[PDB]
Amino acid sequence: LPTWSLDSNGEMRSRLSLSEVLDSGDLMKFAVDKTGCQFLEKAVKGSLTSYQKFQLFEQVIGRKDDFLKLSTNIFGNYLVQSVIGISLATNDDGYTKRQEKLKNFISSQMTDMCLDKFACRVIQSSLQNMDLSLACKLVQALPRDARLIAICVDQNANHVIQKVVAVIPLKNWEFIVDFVATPEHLRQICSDKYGCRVVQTIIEKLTADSMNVDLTSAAQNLRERALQRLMTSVTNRCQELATNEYANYIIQHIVSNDDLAVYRECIIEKCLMRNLLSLSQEKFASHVVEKAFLHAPLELLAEMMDEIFDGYIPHPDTGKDALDIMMFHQFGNYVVQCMLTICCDAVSGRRQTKEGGYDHAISFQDWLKKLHSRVTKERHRLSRFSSGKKMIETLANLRS
RNA sequence: UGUGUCAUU
């Protein structure tokens, strides 16, 4: 800090005024100092005269280099966000110029700011607070090449994309949806810890659910088309995605959401059906298989059940079947528990059995009887395992 | 007996 602002202890003076700091030309020293910025942050929340604001506007968001330096600073980024807020609240003759300048500063450095731990916060605040027409311009400044992948998978920058999706109309970021849906991009992004979160957020915003009822019908049509395009791409690679350590959450989200029912059915038909035994033995895809059992429409559920009970040839020597394999498998056992719980819920009326113009209770009773018969026959081996004890207890609870 | 994300003074 400037010596004029210090005690004989080398400690920032108390009773310092905002105007002293503004007048001094030393603001940049305060704004990057923990104690100095703390003072500024408190001072700018109080009453400010027109000239105090004018000075803050000039010194904090008025020149590109100082704006970037504070925006990328651990302490200064807070002051930048505060001053942007004051600027937006001050409708004097300088308003338009200030906001255009802010848009220009940010746009010109968009990628670098998004990737920065602190400046990404300035971006997010600006996107939700600036006049919408200007916030849309920021979105336009996002890169469209490999740098956009870097942004999507970045620990900081992914939150910028999530903010865009939250507070900007789809038309402005539809290019991101098309970018992500490119086969090679989808692969990279979905297979990333942060990238998969970005894709899930996009899917959520593109869903015609209770949160989108305020869209005009024209906007709904734009959304439906973008969703259809993204789902086509996801469906084209669902085997790869379902089995992946991160992308399996995306497939689960789609399968689990009633508002995505048509896409749920595509996925089940495209990569799960005929692969249930194999996928049930996978660390990540076994969770997807469970969701499919839990949410499939009755006709597909019947096909799935039929596949487990009768879809596979028993081992030529031992006579072990798919059910034997899954019940004792480290991941498969949870799929079998899921099947049983579904059937018990249905028969005990915890799950609605009417669908497709028919009451399918008879089907659930049938599947339940097959499970009960297997569990009975194999009760001794099953009782050796937590999963087996659980199934035995599940059937015991139903009887009661 | 089996997986992630949810990040600044």
From Swiss-Prot:
Record has GTP-binding as a keyword: no
Residue span, PUM-HD domain: 1-399
Annotated Gene Ontology cellular component terms: cytoplasm; nucleus; P granule
Keywords: Cytoplasm, Developmental protein, Differentiation, Repeat, RNA-binding, Sexual differentiation
Key word Repeat present: yes
Record note on what altering residue 314 to A does: Does not affect binding to lst-1
Pumilio repeats: 20-58, 59-97, 104-140, 141-165, 178-217, 233-269, 271-306, 317-354
Effect of residue 316 to G: Does not affect binding to lst-1
Impact upon substituting residue 287 to Y/F/W/N/R: Switches nucleotide specificity at positions +2 and +3 in the RNA target
Site positions per UniProt: Interacts with lst-1: 312
One GO BP annotation of this record: cell differentiation
GO function terms (MF aspect): mRNA 3'-UTR binding; RNA binding
Location(s), subcellular: Cytoplasm; Cytoplasmic granule
Entry function: RNA-binding protein that binds to the consensus sequence 5'-UGUGCCAUA-3' in mRNA 3'-UTRs. Involved in the control of stem cells and sex determination in the C.elegans hermaphrodite germline. May also play a role in the hermaphrodite germline proliferation and oogenesis. By binding to the 3'-UTR, represses phosphatase lip-1 expression in the distal part of the germline mitotic zone. Binds specifically to the regulatory region of fem-3 3'-UTR and mediates the sperm/oocyte switch. Negatively regulates gld-3 expression possibly by directly binding to two sites within the gld-3 isoform b 3'-UTR.
Quaternary state and interactors: Interacts (via C-terminus) with gld-3 isoform A in an RNA-independent manner. Interacts with dlc-1, and is required for the localization of fbf-2 to P granules. Interacts (via RNA-binding domain) with lst-1, probably displaces bound auto-inhibitory C-terminal tail and alters its RNA-binding affinity.
Protein name: Fem-3 mRNA-binding factor 2
Organism listed in the record: Caenorhabditis elegans
Lineage: Eukaryota, Metazoa, Ecdysozoa, Nematoda, Chromadorea
Span within the parent record: 168 to 567 of 632
